[model samples]
Target: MIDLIVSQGRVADRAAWMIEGAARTARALEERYGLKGHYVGEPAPHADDDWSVALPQARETLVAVREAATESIKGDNLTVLVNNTCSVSLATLPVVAREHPDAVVLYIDGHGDFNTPETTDTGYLGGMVLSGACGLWDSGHGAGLRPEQAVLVGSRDIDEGERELIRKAGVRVIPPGEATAQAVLDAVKDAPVWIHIDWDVLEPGSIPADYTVPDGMLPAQIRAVFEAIPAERLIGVELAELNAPADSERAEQAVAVILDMVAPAFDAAAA
Candidate 1:
C-alpha cells in the first residue's frame, strides 16, 4: 500500500496542483505495479504568509496516516518516510524517528536544516528540523532526534550556527560543487533509505519550483542521483515545497522524472 500526503498551502493554491499530480502519478504507479491500496494522507488548509500555522497540522495528519500504514503492513517488512519540505520534515521527523528506531533517512535538500531556535536568525522551524532530529536544538519536547544515525544529503545553503552543528554532529553535506547524488547513494550503503526531495535544491530556471537556488543540481543530475540508489532499498519518497506558480510545468516534469528513475523498483515490486 502507498500513502501520498498532499499539503495545499494555507495561503496559496500551490499544493492543489501538487496533490493532483501526485494522485495522477499514483494511478500510474498502481497500474504499472498492480498495487492493492493507495491512500492520501490528509488535506491541508490554505493560508497566507504565516504558513507555519499549518506546519504542525501536516505532521499530525501524516502521523495518523502513517500509523495506519504501519499497522497494515507486515511487521518484518521495511518502512520508509520521505520528507518533502524543510519545515514539515523538521516538524515531524523526530517523532517518526522515536516511533521507528530502525528507519533510515535519505534527505535531499538545499539547506542544512541544522539550526536551533537559539542559533537561528529566521526562526523558521523547518530550517531546524535536522537540528531537532539530531538533538542539536532544544524543542522543549521529545522532538529531538538521535543524530548519530540520521543522514542529510546535498545540503548547500547553511548558516553559521548550522555549520557548527554539522561539524559537531558529524552530519554529511553534499556540497553543490561536489558529486552530491552519487555521494548520497554511497552514504546509505546497506541501510534501507527513506528518500526526501526538496524542490528548492534545483538550480534556478532548471526547475520551476519555489526554492530554486542559483547554483544547484540539474534535473538530469537529480535523476542520476536517484537512479544510483538500489530500488529495493527505498522505503518511501516525498517531493516538497514545489510552489505551484513557479513550477506548473517543472512540477509535472519532476513527477515524470521521479517515476522514470524509480521505474525498476516499481516494476520489481509488482513482479
Candidate 2:
C-alpha cells in the first residue's frame, strides 16, 4: 500500500479546524482512491505565528516532526506520500531522504528554500531547508541527495542569497516564466521526485498565500506542471505555508488538485 503522511501542525482552538479539515481530505483520498497512509498531527510550535526563528531552537520542532514522519514511513510498497502543512520541520526533508532515498523532490514554491544557516539574513528556518538537505548545515538539519539530483523548480520570488545557494547546490532552477513540464521532465528523467507545493507560489488573486511572487506560475501553469510530474516516480507530494483558517475553499481547492493527479496512480497500485 502507498503510505501518505499528513501533518497536524495546527494547535490553536480555532486554527485547529485545519487539523480536522486536513483529516477529511486524507480520508477522501483513502476512501475515494483506495490509498493507505497515516496522519501526523501536532500543535503548531509557533501557535499562529509564522515568524522566522533560529535553527537551533527550531531543531526541537524538526526532531518531533521528523520522528513522526519516520514512524509513518515504512516498506518498499510506499509509493506516494503527501505533506499538507505550513511551517515544515527541517527534519522532514532528511527523513524522506533516508527512508525514500529514490524519490525526486519537486519543490513547487515561489521561494528557493535553499538558504544555508550563514546565508539567511532573516534567520528563518524555512529558507535554510534546501541547504540543510544538501548537507550544507551543521545541525543535521539536511543531508540527502547531491547537488545534481536536488532540482529547484518554480522559483519566482527568490532572494539574491537564495539564488546563489541554489546555483552552488547545482540545482536546476526552473524560473516561473521560463519552464514547462516537458522541460522539467527531461531534467529528472528516471529519478524519483518529491513534489513540494508551497501555496505562496500563486498570485495574490489566486489566494492568500505567504507572499505573492511577481509573474509567478498561474493556476493553469501550475496544473500543467503537475500533470507532467512522473507520478510513478513521485516519491511524495506536500503543500505547506498556507494556513487557511478562513480560506477553506482555497485550501480544499489546493488539496483537490493534487489528489486528482496522484489518485489514479494509487488506484493502479492494487491492480
Candidate 3:
C-alpha cells in the first residue's frame, strides 16, 4: 500500500492555498496510482516575518509528520509526503537516515536550501533546511545528514552564502542536464536515496508556484530524470511549494504531469 501524507507542516508564510495544493497533489497520486491518503497538522499561523515564533513550531509539527511517514515505510511499499513548503525536509531528510542510515538526500529545488541563520538575507526558514539537516545549524530536529550525503539538484537561484557554504561543506550540486541516474548513483555510491522536489524547480508558466525562477527544467527533462532513477534506490518522495489557484483545470493537469513523471519510478520499483 502507498502512504500519501498531506500536510501543511510547520510552515508560516503560505495561504490556505498551501493545504489545497498539497491535498490536490496527494489525492492525485492516490487517484492515479490506486492508493490511500493520510493527513497530519494544519497550516501554521502566517508567521512569515517572525522567526522566533515560526522556528520553534516547525520542529514540533515537522517531527510529528516525519514519524507518520518514516515509521510505516518498508520494503517494496511507497511513501509520499506532500507539504506546502520546503521547511518539511528539516525532519524529512534526517529521519530517512534514522531509519536507513546510509540514505542520501536528492534535493531538487529551484533555490539552494543550504543557508543557515547566519547566512540568510531573507528570513525564510525553508532556505536553511538542507544546512540544518546537515548539522550546520541547529534546527531542533535531529541532524542525521552530513554535507557529503546531500546532492542538491537543478540549480536556479542559489544565494552567495549557500554557494560558499556548499563549497566549504562539500555538498555536491548537480546542474540540470547533468542529473542522470548514473551521475546520482556515483555520488551516493550505492546508498538509498530520499528524493525531494520543490515545484518551483520547473520553468514558470508550466506550473504555478510562489516563486518563479528562470532557466528551470522543462517537463520532459524532469520526467526523464524520474524515469531514469534505479527504482530500488528510492526510499520515498517529498513534494513541496505547489501553489495552485483554487478551482482550476490547468493545475489538475499539472498534477497529472507530476504523476506522469513520478509514477515510472513507482512502477519500476514493483517491476
Candidate 4:
C-alpha cells in the first residue's frame, strides 16, 4: 500500500488552480497505482493570507501527515506527500527524520529555501522551511536534519543571504548535471533519502506552475537524478508547487511525467 498525503495550498498567494491540480493529481496517482491513499486534513483555505491562521493549520496538517507516514513506515509502504507548496516540508520532513533518524533530504528546488525570519526581507515562510528543518530558526517544528545531511539540488536562484547560510551550514549544493546517484550516495553515504522536488526547479515553461525561472533542469536531467538513487535508499518522496494548468490535458501530462520519474524507484524497492 502506498500512502499519499494530499496537501493543497497554504498561502493566500496560491491560486485555486493549485488546489485543483493537487486533487486531480492525487486522483490520478490513485487510479494508476491502485491505492486510494489518504488525506490528512481539510483542504487549505483558499488564498489564506493570515500567518496566524495558516501556520496553526499547517501544524495540524503536519501532525496528520506524520501519523500517516508512521503507519506507512511500519507497513513498509512507499509514501508520497503532495503539497501545493514546498513550505509543508517545514513540518513534514522533520517528522520523517524523527521517525528515521538516519534519513537525509534531497531538496530539489529552483531557489534555496535557506532563509530565516531575520535574514528574509520578504518574510516568506516557504523560504524559511529548510532553515526550520535544520533548526536554524524557530518555525515551531522539531529539528532533525543537519546541513551535512541536507542536500540541495537544482538551485539556480539562491539569495545572497541563503548562499551565506547554506555555506555556513555546510550543506552541499548539487547542480543539475551533477545530481547523479553516486554523488548523492557519497554525501549521505547509505543514509535513507527523503526526496523533495519543487516543480519550479524545472526549466521555465516546462510545466504550468505559479512561478518559473530560467535555466532549470530538464525532464531527462531530473529523471537521471532519480534513477541514480537505489530504491533501498529512497525513503519518501514529495512533489510540490504543481499549480494546476488552465488546460486539464496539460495537468494530466504533467502528472504522467512525474509518475514516470518515480516508477523506477518504486519498482526497484518492490523488487
TM for every model, in the order presented, reads 0.71, 0.74, 0.89, 0.87
121-219: candidate 1 lDDT, tens digit per residue: 754566666776667655433454556556766567677767878878877666656645667667766776666667666666643556644477666
- Candidate 2 clash pair list: 8-41, 83-238, 86-241, 103-192, 104-192, 104-193, 104-194, 105-194, 106-194, 132-142
Give the winner by TM-score: 3
Assess the local accuracy of residue 149 in candidate 4 as a C-alpha lDDT between 0 and 100.
79
Q: For residues 1-271, what per-residue lDDT tens digits would candidate 2 score against the true structure?
A: 5666666544222234455555656665777666655555554434433223334434454566676567655554443434434345356667777766765676777888777656767655566556767687754556875656667666876787778777876887887776677877887778776666665676556455457555776666666666676456655556555444434676676566656645544554444
Residue-level lDDT tens digits of model 3 in 131-164: 8888989888778787878888886557676898
Check candidate 4 and list the clashing pairs: 12-47, 12-48
Better of 3 and 4 by lDDT: 3
In model 1, which residue pairs have backbone atoms overlapping below 3 Å? 10-46, 10-47, 11-46, 11-47, 11-48, 87-126, 133-145, 200-211
Question: Could you tell me which 10 consecutive residues in candidate 3 have the lowest summed lDDT?
Answer: 205-214
lDDT of 4 at 78: 76
Q: Name model 1 segments beyond 4 Å from true.
A: 1-59, 72-86, 90-103, 138-145, 180-182, 206-214, 245-250
TM-score of 2: 0.74
lDDT of 4 at 157: 58
Error of 2 at 213 (Å): 13
lDDT of 4 by residue, 75-94 (tens): 67777877777777777777
Q: Which has the better TM-score: candidate 3, or candidate 4?
A: 3
Model 4 scores a C-alpha lDDT of 0.74
